[PDB]
Ligand binder design. Structure first.
Ligand code: HEC
Ligand code: HEC
Lengths: 80, 82
């Protein structure tokens, strides 16, 4: 059962649920760490969509303003 | 607006979360792979106890400190997550 799995340490290496279709933000933050122009580049990808970085499924454009895209980019890159 | 708020209200939440996947497969995915597969309980109980590699990737599951009875109970529980 679930309680036995927890006690035995199984959940250190296993999630109950599958990953979402896009990359986890902590992974995005780590990928861009120490990269020039990360903030601006990520804001553009959030607004305009992106592909070929993490897998075969593209991210479509998002209906966000320039300011919203920058806010979100900075927040993503800060996830430590 | 706060990014946490935008993250939810602009649809990002449909496709993204904060935390990365753990090293082994998600139990929901194990359940899906082995549903209706003959001998799934005994197969998985064996892997849980003995450890193994190569089915989901090259990262191994170490042998686990469980009794045979616990390994079977854990396999049965995982197979129910669907
Ligand atoms: C709502 C506004 C958001 C925000 C803030 C982000 N996304 Fe997505 N995203 C999705 C997929 C499949 C990818 C990977 C595409 C590929 O393989 O190239 C992404 C990528 C991102 C990133 C990382 C960009 C990079 O180049 O590293 C970031 C920061 C990001 N997203 C933020 C999928 C989806 C969705 C599926 C339908 C939706 C909706 C969104 N993303 C929305 C957002
Ligand atoms: C605690 C007792 C548990 C339980 C109940 C399970 N695990 Fe793991 N596990 C890990 C890795 C890397 C894998 C993939 C191995 C491969 O690619 O072949 C697995 C796999 C499983 C399965 C599926 C086995 C299969 O052949 O399909 C199951 C049912 C499972 N585990 C249950 C990694 C780890 C850990 C990392 C250190 C730890 C701890 C555990 N697992 C513990 C458990």
């Amino acid at each position: 059962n679930e309680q036995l799995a927890k006690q035995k340490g199984c959940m250190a290496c296993h999630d109950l649920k599958a990953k979402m279709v896009g990359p986890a933000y902590k992974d995005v933050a780590a990928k861009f760490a120490g990269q020039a122009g990360a903030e601006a580049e990520l804001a553009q990808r959030i607004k305009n969509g992106s592909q070929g970085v993490w897998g075969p499924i593209p991210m479509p454009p998002n209906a966000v303003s320039d300011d919203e895209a920058q806010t979100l980019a900075k927040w993503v890159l800060s996830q430590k | 607006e706060d990014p946490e708020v935008l993250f939810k209200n602009k649809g990002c939440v449909a496709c993204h979360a904060i935390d990365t996947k753990k090293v082994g497969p998600a139990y929901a995915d194990v359940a899906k792979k082995y549903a209706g597969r003959k001998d799934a309980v005994d197969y998985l109980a064996g892997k849980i106890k003995k450890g193994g590699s190569g089915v989901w990737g090259s990262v191994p599951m170490p042998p686990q400190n469980v009794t045979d009875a616990e390994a079977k109970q854990l396999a049965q529980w995982i197979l129910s997550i669907k």
